[PDB]
């Protein structure tokens, strides 16, 4: 996702 | 013997706390997480620090996420510490940042090979 950010659950950044 | 992160180093307070800001209100349901593996384990670190994770999930299924990342082999434990306790199973991990996110909006959260930190 933004900023760096991974959710955590998908792995999207 | 005491939680120490490499990130809050790298990144000074009030950079911190106005990305906290912005993430918090961009990602409401979900919790932003500084995972770092803690001085002295034997496991090696992530690839990335930063994770948004959703404030429903149970810290041990947050655990089992973390473990994936790592590669961890299933029979290598691991035990994570925030502000120097193992946290609880049954919290989920919004319960878990009401009770320990930083003035920087983030929580923080170090994991290790051994059951005590600093070891
Ligand atoms: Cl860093
Ligand atoms: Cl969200």
């Known amino acids: 996702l933004e900023?760096?950010?991974?959710d955590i659950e998908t792995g999207k950044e | 013997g005491s939680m120490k992160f490499?990130?809050?180093?790298?990144?000074?307070?009030?950079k911190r706390r106005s990305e906290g800001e912005k993430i918090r209100?961009?990602?409401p349901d979900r919790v932003p997480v500084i995972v770092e593996k803690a001085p002295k384990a034997r496991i090696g670190?992530?690839?990335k620090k930063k994770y948004l994770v959703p404030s429903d999930l149970?810290?041990?299924?947050?655990?089992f996420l973390?473990?994936?990342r790592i590669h961890l082999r299933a029979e290598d434990a691991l035990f994570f510490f925030v502000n120097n306790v193992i946290p609880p199973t049954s919290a989920t991990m919004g319960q878990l940042y009401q009770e320990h996110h930083e003035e920087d909006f983030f929580l923080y959260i170090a994991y290790s090979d051994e059951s005590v930190y600093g070891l």
């Open chain 2, 66 to 68: 973390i473990r994936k």
């Open chain 2, 45 to 47: 670190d992530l690839d």
């Open chain 2, 6 to 14: 490499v990130y809050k180093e790298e990144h000074p307070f009030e």
């Open chain 2, 58 to 63: 149970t810290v041990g299924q947050f655990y």
């Open chain 2, 25 to 27: 209100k961009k990602y």
């Open chain 1, 3 to 6: 900023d760096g950010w991974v």
